[PDB]
Amino acid sequence: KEVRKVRIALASPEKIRSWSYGEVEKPETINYRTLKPERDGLFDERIFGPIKDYECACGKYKRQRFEGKVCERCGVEVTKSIVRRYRMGHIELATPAAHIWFVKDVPSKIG
Amino acid sequence: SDPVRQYL
Amino acid sequence: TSVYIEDVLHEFSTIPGVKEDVVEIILNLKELVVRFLNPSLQTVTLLLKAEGPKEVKARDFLPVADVEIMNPDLHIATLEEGGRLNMEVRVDRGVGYVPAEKHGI
Amino acid sequence: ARTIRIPVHMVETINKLSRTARQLQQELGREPTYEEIAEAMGPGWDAKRVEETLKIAQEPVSLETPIGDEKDSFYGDFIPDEHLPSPVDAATQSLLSEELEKALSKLSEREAMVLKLRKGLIDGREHTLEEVGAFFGVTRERIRQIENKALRKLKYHESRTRKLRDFLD
Amino acid sequence: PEWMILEAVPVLPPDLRPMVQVDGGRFATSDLNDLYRRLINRNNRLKKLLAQGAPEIIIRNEKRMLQEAVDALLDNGRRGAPVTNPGSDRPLRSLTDILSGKQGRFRQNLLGKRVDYSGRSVIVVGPQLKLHQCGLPKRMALELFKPFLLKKMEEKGIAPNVKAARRMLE
Amino acid sequence: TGGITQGLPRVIELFEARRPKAKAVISEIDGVVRIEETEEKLSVFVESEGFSKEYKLPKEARLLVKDGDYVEAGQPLTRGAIDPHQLLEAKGPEAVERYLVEEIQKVYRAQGVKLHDKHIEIVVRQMMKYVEVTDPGDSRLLEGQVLEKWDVEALNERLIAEGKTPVAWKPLLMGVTKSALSTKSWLSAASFQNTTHVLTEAAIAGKKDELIGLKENVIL
Amino acid sequence: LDSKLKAPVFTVRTQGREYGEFVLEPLERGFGVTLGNPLRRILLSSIPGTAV
Amino acid sequence: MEIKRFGRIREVIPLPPLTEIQVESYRRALQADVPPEKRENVGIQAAFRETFPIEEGLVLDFLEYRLGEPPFPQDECREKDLTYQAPLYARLQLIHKDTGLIKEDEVFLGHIPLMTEDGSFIINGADRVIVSQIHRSPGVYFTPDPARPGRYIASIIPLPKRGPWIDLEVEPNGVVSMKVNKRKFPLVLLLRVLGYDQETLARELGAYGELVQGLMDESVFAMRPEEALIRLFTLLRPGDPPKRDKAVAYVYGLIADPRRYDLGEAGRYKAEEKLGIRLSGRTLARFEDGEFKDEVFLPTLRYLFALTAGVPGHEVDDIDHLGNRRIRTVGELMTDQFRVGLARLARGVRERMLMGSEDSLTPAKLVNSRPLEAAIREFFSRSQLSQFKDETNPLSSLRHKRRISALGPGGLTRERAGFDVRDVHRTHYGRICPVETPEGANIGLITSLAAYARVDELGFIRTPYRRVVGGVVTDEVVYMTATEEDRYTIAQANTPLEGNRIAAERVVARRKGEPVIVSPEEVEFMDVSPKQVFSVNTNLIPFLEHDDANRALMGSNMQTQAVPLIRAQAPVVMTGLEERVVRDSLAALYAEEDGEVAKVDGNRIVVRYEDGRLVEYPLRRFYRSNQGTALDQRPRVVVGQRVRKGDLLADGPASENGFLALGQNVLVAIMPFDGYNFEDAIVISEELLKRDFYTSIHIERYEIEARDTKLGPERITRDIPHLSEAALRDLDEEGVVRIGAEVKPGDILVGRTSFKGESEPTPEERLLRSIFGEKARDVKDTSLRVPPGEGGIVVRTVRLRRGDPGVELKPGVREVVRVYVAQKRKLQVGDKLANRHGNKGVVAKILPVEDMPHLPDGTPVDVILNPLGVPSRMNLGQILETHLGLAGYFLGQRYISPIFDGAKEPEIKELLAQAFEVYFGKRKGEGFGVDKREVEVLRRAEKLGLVTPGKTPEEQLKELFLQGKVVLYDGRTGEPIEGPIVVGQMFIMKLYHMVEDKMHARSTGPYSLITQQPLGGKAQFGGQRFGEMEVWALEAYGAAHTLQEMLTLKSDDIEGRNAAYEAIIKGEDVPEPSVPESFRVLVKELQALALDVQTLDEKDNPVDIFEGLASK
DNA sequence: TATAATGGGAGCTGTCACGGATGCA
DNA sequence: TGCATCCGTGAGTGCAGC
Ligand SMILES: [Zn+2]
């Protein structure tokens, strides 16, 4: 189909979670010794996808034709690494927090 | 205004 | 069309005991006027060997058959005690202005 | 405190190395070498260990780090993407596949297919001799032999047309 | 309306906030990672302080800090002092910063872009040129038209193939 | 030195439809001019048959009026640039269009720049693009709600065709910036300026960009 | 340094006895005006003719 | 050759040392030569004295400091990328008050950068310059309130980062308000804190009736100094507990604390002079005997009320006046950052003092030098005032050191900058050059110190004048500030003198800048020279008085950009300043004392002096500058030559026999030529290239590192995979290209191999290599190659390795290799040429010699300049320069024509007459008469009224020659130019803007990480920016596909750009564009802002631009 | 894992004009 | 209800820039 219109709207928590491929539970980025991403971190391949094309983290499945497959050992989907610029993660807050755009923008929409 | 002041 | 100097790898170098740098030496050698007698002769390599203290002129070039320098008083280099200069300079027949960049001789 | 997290014992070792180097520089009137720091750290510590410890201690720098006296230049603007294949690389892989298929139509169906199976052009995995042999219904020795003759014919044709040479860099 | 409050804060794909090894093996990364790390640290500490039955002053402080963390992430310096990295006065670059301004996504990468098959040089008067013509330096042309030139080199005996032609022009 | 500074100033002022500090005082209605000047204070009255109006101005102001003269509504009483909005409420849209065009052209002519009226007219047209509702009629609109003239006209033609009460509206003049931020396409506006504002209002409204203009299509 | 190249080809375009165009290429640098000017001077001043 | 100089004005004093502004400043700051006990309270010593003693009971005190010798010399620092610096030790003693225990030790604080002899620094191997800052001098100012006329603002301003600005204003409600940290509060409260009784304020301020009544508030006087203090504290600190000692602490720190609040010494002086009082300390008040005592506040209030009332002897202040604007030089800036780092070190000290063990604490354990080191390093690296030194030519450095900037920390930002400060104030006379400033955004913000100008100890720029008593002009020279200068009537430097007495009935002078005609009885002072009005650069423009200022600016600025030429020559027409510039810049090498030359070498000059000692001078040879210009010194003397003191031993870059040589003297004709000189373009003769005029040496440095990785070590080797021996031809055994080899783009400078990551060899590639029998290697070719458009001869290689003596690299680096490549650049088409009068142009054409316009004697011109560049530009100096240049061509002489005391038309006419005789009489003797073409041209000129009818051809030719015009022959025809043409010698320079550096082109190349758009810049092999306005151009043309290509296929559309490249190499037309990646980046970045952006169709149904990859 | 210890610390000053809110007289 | 007044937001392009 041809793109005609472009819509922009508020995103519900449900929508945001629908976007997310996983929750990031840890501040960690990459391991100091290995320089690999850390589990449940901001760079996690489990959440955001494989760093290498069609190859999981542990290296159990290295080939295409293993598509959509998820490794049991490392939990990483085998697919194109391009998805690392696409798939969103999320952080579940203990206390709800106001989006500052709808607060500090005068006149305040919430206000 | 100043979070530290408020907390103190 | 060309200059070789012993213990000189390129134009950007200086020689111990010689006042002029190589850029200046070549600039002076570019003023050299060499007459050929025999019309059949295309090229001549002028050999120069000298040591100081002396002021090396174009006259100091070792003579070649059917070759006359029309400006023997032309300055080449200034050599100092311990200063030693050994050159082989290639002079060719030709026409117009051909830059070093083009002929690469 | 670190964008790249470091274990507490390792942070202790790093800070200890820092304090050691600082004292050493305080008595040396200059920054110490790796060897002097290694001396002051005790046994088990050589220059290489100090050097690698300092290496792993290095913190990352901001991509938004400003460049120039104006506000218009980021440090990250100078950093190329090595991951995504260049148009040249992509086109080269494309012409490579197309040319290999040339030689495909070249060798017979069986030997070309055996080669594609063993080298992984089909499912991407590289099959063993027993798999291609059980697939074509022959012995592993036989399938190995037809693989050999396939590769051999490819070698001859390659020496002949010099087509696949330029892709070898 | 309640969607103007965030229960779950989205996380940008990592490639858009890269952690990259530069030439020398040293690492360079986007500020968004530091912002997200502040956020996650404060959130986690909040969950642990809750689970452990902390007094109200503490939980209040933590919640306030959490809101300010979210603020810093989405629009930094919008309310209160801008969050900076240790040992620097430089404000961290948040999503709002990324979007707007002259250096923002729209103006920099969207309404305009750097392009391929382009070059530049000094200009010199053309008096012999006809109105529809310009003098173009040979080498500039060799580079700008390069793929066409590879193709035409293959169309003739100049090169066996495209890759050979390119390796030849190297 | 020896024998477009001002120029650019004035132009920008005009294209931003800004109320000048040099502002000339204009008559809101028709009438006859009765000047009343005490040595200490000066004032100018405009007297119609039905009613009279009073304009109190500093005694040092230059008057463009002779005592006992009949002045049109919106006609300058004093020198200085006219407030385009006052001219709008007084003499209407065409007057303002003519004023903006001629005024902008003065500056360019002064510097020896030959430029066609058309372009300035295009811009001014974009400046007049909006209206403000005086009464909603039978519509869903609100009093003081700003919208596009085309939209209120289409609406009113639908209401008239339906037999309903038309929307009472007044012409609205805004400067180029506000007009650009007030455009229908949210991609265009958000990429222009005030990104967060445009984006939040659009997101709350669930705005759809129909990709009518050039900017949007460029962005995509 | 080495220079050897071919002699130029003389090209002729003639319409009637009234007009003609004469093209000589390639020539060494500058020789276009070296030949052109003297010929123009001669063609205007020295060509035998008749007059009243 | 003979140098003839014009002008009657005799300069009483020479130019002061031109780098003194840097040198004496930094020397004053360090006090390294001063034995510690004799040091003053200024400089880094001041910072030590402010920081220490450190208390809170342990007490750390400061005895003295010392600076050691530099661990490495300047050159070695340049090569090893080190910093020229000296170790800084500080002797400290910890004293426990109770115990009485005193532990004394000298602690090492790290290093401080040393300034070189020429007034520059070496930071990490690169030469830098700290640029002087200009700012508002601290003190008490009174300025008109812009809103309400009749009311004024009294501003009390301290030094930058020295505490808050304080405003005093009379409010419409009648009460006097004080503003501090944006807080308006009644001043009477603070007045009460200082302990002022209503009676004292009444008797003091009573003289002004209406105002003091507004000052009176009984609710304040009903309080006590304590209660008032706590009240003020509650006003400045809401929510903060109003404890007594805390309020005392805050108010003391805000006003009376010398460490927190500092007016400069200059602020002190100016406050004293303005308010007519005497200041004890540098603060606004004191804490004495338990209470506070006022200093500045009451006098300020008194003055403010007096000005408001109209009381005589009270005026507002001109904040742009150069009496109110001072300069912060290197010493002050460096000292400032030193003070900051020291403060941090002190904080750390108090920390350790509280935490550490009470039995044993040494000063060494208490002091961490790191924060201080960081502060200094930060200043000399990332500061805006710390700039990469401009070494392009010696004058560039000299001028850079003399720069003044209104920008930087504590300075203006270009947004806040507006006219009033970019203006040129009358007080700039003799101080700041009115001419040399940037044309663009920095105009008036970046300026230049005038030639005779000096910065005093207080930081004010002073210019010399001469005492005039009874019309007699003394040799006594007095340097005044602008404030002092305003007090006198100062005569112009050109006022006619017989002996030391002024002879004119009427003289032209200045009184407070105002031009006035006065009698000699009224003259108090007289200018030293016209030179003092301008900068060092502007002073290099001959016939300056004939050039419009706008082009003088351009000539000035462009001289900085002149490239040193191998054949470089001094101008035929000089200003007289050419030698001092060479000398002060330390470019040339000179003889220390009278002596005899022992040895002369390319590399060395050995001199034997009167002392009998043998002093050897090494010559810097083909060294690379910051801008890549070659800096080399050549010996100008010979063996056995006797040299007196201050004699020239050797010429540095851009120096011909000790005279500044910025370019060549070329023979120009001013005529249009076949459109090739159209719009400032320039035509030159190939003869210039033949004789190597405008040829310059440039050296470029390349660098590569081989480091330890986790995939295995990178290594520098000659063994490079898949490479022939043809490519390794010039590589040595170790893999580094050999000295003397010629390198072209694509050539390897240094061989390097790197191990491949998981690049799981494409089972595609597995197959490939197996077929081809060649096994897939594990290493790949990372070697450093000559970038496109570069090359030359390799003149140097530097190889540093880990495990080598005296060598330690940054962690992980196994080895570093540098390769220095030199190139000889001939002048070419597109290179920028300029003269000193602001005439600039790019060379558009190089003709063979036979095509050049020539003189009747067969002499071709060098350069053809279009006359159309003259009239609108109004720089006639170049014309005069040409005329005189013509004379000196035939007389074989050079001239000195001082600015404003010049060569005049009649004198040039005389010289031109002599020159004409030389140019003609020779012909007449040679047996040749006047040419037919000359006759025709004479007829033409006779119609133009250039020559008089009836005179002989010779007489007329002379008549033209006196006008600087000569008959000129077209080289292409032989027929003469119909009019006579202006021909003569002009000094023209080759500017640093060279097409060889600027020419760039790209098909495809590296892309950015996030945006996937092409990188910018030549060095990165980047694409040109097609920006919003270029887009507007394409839109305006209605070319949709060209535009869409720009937005997609050619930039960030991945699939699109790939498919496009492949399509083009195949010969297919380019495929249809796709979504540009940065739009996806936009969508995902908006999602991160919790906004849902949906691409929809006309059915309002969602469309996936991420193609399922983003959806679960 | 235990002597007692109980409210921070750095401010940043030379724009400039407009739109739009908000408050106070 | 009109008018201070405070806050927030803008302020040319491409080169290079360490
Ligand atoms: Zn796995």
Closest-lying nucleotide for A111 based on CA to C1': I21
Say if CB H81 and CB H124 are below 8 A apart: yes
The ranges assigned to domains in chain H are 1-6+662-694+827-991, 16-137+318-463+529-587, 138-317, 464-528, 588-652, 695-826
Domain H695-826 matching CATH 3.20.20.140: the answer reads: no
Residue type, D95: L
Please give the DSSP secondary-structure letter assigned to residue H548. Answer: -
Rounded Cα gap, residues H972 and G37, in angstroms: 8
> In angstroms, what CA-CA distances link H632 with H603, H618, H619, H653, H797?
10, 11, 7, 6, 19
Rounded Cα gap, residues F55 and H573, in angstroms: 71
Beta-sheet pairing, H291-294 with A5-10? unpaired
Say if CB D149 and CB D111 are below 8 A apart: yes
Rounded Cα gap, residues F187 and F202, in angstroms: 10
The three-state secondary structure class of E61 is helix
Domain limits for position C84 = 1-105
Our CA angle for H380, H384, H386, nearest 5°, is 35
**CB neighbour list of residue F188: distance below 8 Å, 6 or more residues apart:** F180, F209, F213, F215, F216
Query: Domains of chain D, with CATH numbers?
Result: 6-59 (1.10.10.10), 85-165 (1.10.10.10)
Joined tokens for residue C82? 């311990």
Rounded Cα gap, residues H111 and G29, in angstroms: 65
**Which of H348, H347, H366 is CA-nearest to residue H357?**
H366
Say if CB C80 and CB H600 are below 8 A apart: yes
Rounded Cα gap, residues H694 and H1112, in angstroms: 68
Helix and strand numbers (H, E) in chain D are: 7, 1
Interval between CA H762 and ligand 1 midpoint (Å): 19
> In angstroms, what CA-CA distances link E23 with D81, H1011, H1023?
11, 19, 21
Q: Is H1031 near chain F, with CB under 8 Å?
A: yes
Rounded Cα gap, residues F30 and F48, in angstroms: 6
**CB neighbour list of residue C87: distance below 8 Å, 6 or more residues apart:** C3, C4, C5, C6, C46, C47, C48, C49
H or E segment to which residue F195 belongs: helix F195-205
Residue type, H1025: R
As ranges, strand J nucleotides with an atom below 7 A of a protein CB are 8-18
Considering only CB atoms, F210 lies closest to which of A5, A8, A101, namely: A5
Domain H588-652 matching CATH 2.40.50.100: the answer reads: yes
For chain A, helix, strand, coil in percent to 5 are: 20, 25, 60
Is the C-beta atom of E157 closer than 7 angstroms to strand J? no
Joined tokens for residue H494? 């050109």
Rounded Cα gap, residues H406 and H319, in angstroms: 14
Rounded Cα gap, residues C96 and C101, in angstroms: 15
Tokens 């030849």, located at residue: E168
Say if CB H264 and CB H140 are below 8 A apart: no
Please give the DSSP secondary-structure letter assigned to residue H124. Answer: T
Rounded Cα gap, residues F87 and F160, in angstroms: 30
Please give the DSSP secondary-structure letter assigned to residue A92. Answer: E
- What is the distance in angstroms measured between the alpha-carbon CA of E101 and the sugar C1' of J9? 11
| Resolution for this experimental structure (Å) | 2.9
Q: Is A65 near chain H, with CB under 8 Å?
A: no
Residue H1100 region by backbone torsions, left for phi larger than 0, else alpha for psi between -120 and 50, else beta: left
Give the best residue of H764, H1096, H1099, H1101 to mutate against chain A (max A CB count within 10 A). H1096
Longest dimension (CA), chain E: 88
Contact yes or no for A80 and H1109 at CB 8 A:
yes
**CB neighbour list of residue E138: distance below 8 Å, 6 or more residues apart:** none
Orientation angle between helical segments E31-51 and E56-74, nearest 10 degrees: 160
Residue A64 backbone phi and psi in degrees, to 5:
-65, -165
Rounded Cα gap, residues H923 and H926, in angstroms: 5
Omega before G26 within 30 of 0, i.e. cis:
yes
Q: Which residue is nearest to nucleotide J10 (CA to C1')?
A: F193
Say if CB H1010 and CB E16 are below 8 A apart: yes
H or E segment to which residue E146 belongs: helix E146-155
Rounded Cα gap, residues H774 and D154, in angstroms: 14
**CB neighbour list of residue B7: distance below 8 Å, 6 or more residues apart:** E61, E64
Say if CB H577 and CB H592 are below 8 A apart: no
Rounded Cα gap, residues F128 and F85, in angstroms: 11
**Which of D136, D96, D97 is CA-nearest to residue D114?**
D136
Orientation angle between helical segments D87-106 and D140-161, nearest 10 degrees: 110
**Residue H771: CB atoms within 10 Å:** 21
**Which of H699, H652, H733, H620 is CA-nearest to residue C10?**
H699
> CATH number of the domain at H138-317, out of 3.40.30.10, 3.30.930.10, 3.90.1110.10, 1.20.140.10?
3.90.1110.10
Interface of A with E in 36-55 (CB under 8 A): 42-43, 48
**Which of H669, B3, H1046, D73 is CA-nearest to residue E62?**
B3
Q: Is the dihedral of CA D67, D72, D78, D84 positive or negative?
A: positive
Say if CB A37 and CB A24 are below 8 A apart: no
DSSP secondary structure of H731-778: B-TTSBBPTT-EE-TT-EEE-EEEE--S----HHHHHHHHHTS----S
Contact yes or no for D96 and H370 at CB 8 A:
no
Q: What is the 3-state secondary structure (H, E, C) of H830-886?
A: CCEEEECCCCEEEEEEEECHHHCCECCCCCECCEEECHHHCCCCCECHHHHHHHHHH
Rounded Cα gap, residues H47 and H66, in angstroms: 14
Whether H464-528 and H695-826 share one fold: the answer is: no
Say if CB H1051 and CB H1076 are below 8 A apart: yes
Rounded Cα gap, residues H131 and H324, in angstroms: 20
Tokens 């008057």, located at residue: F63
Tokens 């962005």, located at residue: F219
Please give the DSSP secondary-structure letter assigned to residue H466. Answer: E
> In angstroms, what CA-CA distances link H747 with D89, F93, H68, H682, H794?
22, 71, 46, 35, 12
Joined tokens for residue F58? 């500093």
Give the residue from chain A lying closest to D6, CA to CA.
Answer: A32
**CB neighbour list of residue H240: distance below 8 Å, 6 or more residues apart:** B5, H233, H246
H or E segment to which residue H813 belongs: strand H813-825
Say if CB H855 and CB H829 are below 8 A apart: no
The β-bridge partners of E19 are: E29
Say if CB F53 and CB F46 are below 8 A apart: yes
Q: Outline where F84-194 has alpha helix (H).
A: 84-91, 93-110, 117-127, 149-162, 176-181, 186-192
The three-state secondary structure class of C31 is coil
**CB neighbour list of residue H294: distance below 8 Å, 6 or more residues apart:** H191, H194, H196, H284, H285
**Residue H76: CB atoms within 10 Å:** 15
Residue C77 belongs to domain with CATH number:
2.170.120.12
Rounded Cα gap, residues C43 and C60, in angstroms: 19
Q: Is the dihedral of CA H437, H438, H439, H440 positive or negative?
A: negative
Considering only CB atoms, H1096 lies closest to which of F203, F208, F218, namely: F208
H or E segment to which residue F46 belongs: strand F42-47
The three-state secondary structure class of A99 is coil
Rounded Cα gap, residues H694 and H846, in angstroms: 13
Joined tokens for residue H138? 């601290």
CATH for H464-528 is 2.30.150.10
Give the best residue of A2, A4, A6, A103 to mutate against chain F (max F CB count within 10 A). A6
Q: Which residue is nearest to nucleotide I8 (CA to C1')?
A: B4
Q: Where are the beta strands (DSSP E) in chain E?
A: 5-11, 19-21, 27-29, 113-114, 118-120
How many structural domains compose chain C?
Answer: 1
H or E segment to which residue F171 belongs: strand F168-172
Say if CB H845 and CB H829 are below 8 A apart: yes
The β-bridge partners of H167 are: H155, H179
Rounded Cα gap, residues H670 and H650, in angstroms: 37
Q: Outline where H311-386 has alpha helix (H).
A: 330-355, 363-366, 370-382
Rounded Cα gap, residues H507 and H524, in angstroms: 12
Strand order in the sheet with H752-755: H715-716, H752-755, H779-781
- What is the distance in angstroms measured between the alpha-carbon CA of F142 and the sugar C1' of J15? 53
Say if CB E38 and CB E69 are below 8 A apart: yes
Say if CB H791 and CB H744 are below 8 A apart: yes
Q: Which residues of chain D neighbour H1007 with C-beta distances below 8 Å?
A: 80-81, 84
Is the C-beta atom of H1024 closer than 7 angstroms to strand J? yes
- What's the CATH superfamily of H1-6+662-694+827-991? DNA-directed RNA polymerase, subunit 2, domain 6 (2.40.270.10)
Say if CB H630 and CB H952 are below 8 A apart: no
Say if CB H1064 and CB E116 are below 8 A apart: no
